Amino acid sequence: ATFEIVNRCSYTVWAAASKGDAALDAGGRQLNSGESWTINVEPGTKGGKIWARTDCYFDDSGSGICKTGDCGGLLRCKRFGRPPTTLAEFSLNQYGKDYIDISNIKGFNVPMDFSPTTRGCRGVRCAADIVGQCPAKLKAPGGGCNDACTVFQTSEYCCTTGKCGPTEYSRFFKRLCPDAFSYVLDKPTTVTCPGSSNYRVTFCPTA
C-alpha cells in the first residue's frame, strides 16, 4: 500500500512511520515545507502509525533528538514516538477491509489530514489549532499539547480497567477535533476503506 506523506507546514518536520516493533518502509525522513515522501507499507500491517516530529537534530549516523515525537533518538523510527504526537493510525487488509483514524490519545503536535487517494471511503481530519488553545496543565514545554494520561498517569485518563469516561481534558480535544479519538473509549471515528486502498497523510492541511 502506498502512503504519500506531505508536509504543508511552513516549517520542516521529520515524518515517522512504524508499527511499534518495526519501522514501516525507511521509518523516517526529513520533510521540508512542501515536500512529499512516498512510502510502501506491507499489506496486512496491523497497528501502523504515521506522525510528524518537530525540532529535530540528527548527526551523520541518523542519531539525535526531536522536541516532539522522538522515537529513541533515531531518524529512521523503529518504535512509536514520545507524546505529544497527533497520530494517523491504520490497520490494512483486516478481513478484506482497511481501517483508518486520527487519534489525539497521545496528544497533539501538528494538524493532520488522513485521506484515501483511491475510491470507496472519506478521509479524516484534525486541522484545528490545538496547540494554541491547549489548556494550561496540558501544554508541553518542548511543544505540543499532551493528553491527560501522559500528564497525570491516573486509571481514569489512561483507561486502565476499560471503565473510564470522558473528562474535561478529553472534551477539549473532542471539541477542537470531533473526528479524532479524544480518549481510549471514545465513540469510534474509525473509517472503513476497501482493502488495499492507498492514502495520503498531510501535515498542516489548512495552513
From Swiss-Prot:
Keywords: Cytoplasmic vesicle, Disulfide bond, Signal, Taste-modifying protein. It is found in: Cytoplasmic vesicle. Disulfide bonds join C9-C204, C56-C66, C71-C77, C121-C193, C126-C177, C134-C145, C149-C158, C159-C164. The keyword Hydrolase does not apply. Its main location: cytoplasm. Belongs to the thaumatin family. This is Thaumatin I. It comes from Thaumatococcus daniellii.
